[PDB]
């Protein structure tokens with residue numbers, strides 16, 4: 417393998433679909449990764465990477481994060497809940513194809529893990545995993561919010577257990593809180609979880625991720641929720657997310673000083689997601705710039721994994737900008753008016769609350 421960025425993709429993950437067929441009623445659809453994949457080729461980025469198929473996560477790998485009941489239920493074939501549309505699912509949004517969902521879920525976990533390992537060995541510089549279904553809502557014994565196995569969490573646990581990375585930063589910029597990821601690593605100080613999400617007083621899915629939630633035991637202070645409050649007006653976008661990176665994410669990340677960075681890279685904070693899917697206005701350029709900023713950490717050992725994002729062009733724009741950043745292309749911050757705008761008052765109060773809480777734990781948060 418050459419020292420460039422790696423891309424993970426495989427058609428096996430397309431097969432995760434409800435039997436009723438309707439991609440509108442079930443918006444977490446195959447087209448999401450399919451369109452990103454062809455977009456990377458159309459724009460000439462795909463051929464510059466090393467393209468990898470990935471693999472099934474083993475039952476053992478799944479059990480490093482999930483319970484035995486959970487893994488039997490979603491990880492294995494029966495032989496070895498009803499929905500309004502007639503298909504089967506765990507709940508109304510989280511569907512279950514009785515032939516393919518388990519396979520596709522295990523592939524997503526397995527492939528994010530395989531990519532992280534290749535990056536951790538410096539066999540690959542960095543990587544982007546174009547996977548579905550998403551993972552960050554799946555917790556120890558609950559599939560929910562379109563998620564079955566927490567691929568990023570499973571990848572992180574394996575890197576640790578195989579001794580391939582001492583300290584791991586997990587950044588989650590999907591607009592929803594990664595409740596699963598927070599839970600798994602809540603008491604482990606060798607994993608730093610930083611989420612930027614729409615919180616709005618706990619009235620936005622999943623409802624978790626309050627600024628107060630800092631971790632526990634040895635892991636106190638190693639869970640950082642940039643929980644945006646105040647709602648959609650004034651608009652939430654680049655000024656606020658750039659501000660979050662300048663003030664919270666990067667300084668804490670640098671103080672932590674990880675050996676590898678994992679990114680739960682959802683693109684549902686992007687333009688084209690209305691309320692109540694997202695309602696935020698983060699541009700593709702900003703996503704690629706955030707990737708570029710995370711590439712300064714951990715000797716450039718960075719792995720992104722697709723979580724959420726529905727609007728096809730928006731998630732294609734963003735994914736394109738992240739891969740370009742991974743390949744070394746740089747974003748000039750002076751090339752965009754609007755990045756000159758101060759962040760809105762809701763974002764400033766949100767960050768102010770994050771700083772008040774985490775000044776107990778981090779020197780870079782301890783002001784006068």
Ligand SMILES: CN1CCC(CNC(=O)c2cccc(-c3noc(C(F)(F)F)n3)c2)(c2nc(-c3ccccc3)cs2)CC1
Nearest residue numbers: 443444550553561562590592621682692693723724725726
């Ligand atoms: C149809 N009806 C009204 C529209 C509906 C609203 N969604 C939610 O309320 C909702 C609830 C739980 C979880 C999530 C969610 N969004 O991203 C993620 C992920 F895990 F990050 F990928 N989870 C979203 C939509 N969901 C999506 C969607 C598309 C791709 C991935 C996830 C959700 C588009 S519209 C679902 C229920």
Ligand SMILES: [K+]
Nearest residue numbers: 588590592612
């Ligand atoms: K998040």
Ligand SMILES: [K+]
Nearest residue numbers: 601604607638
């Ligand atoms: K932690």
Ligand SMILES: [Zn+2]
Nearest residue numbers: 434436501503
């Ligand atoms: Zn259906």
Ligand SMILES: [Zn+2]
Nearest residue numbers: 590592684724
């Ligand atoms: Zn999301």
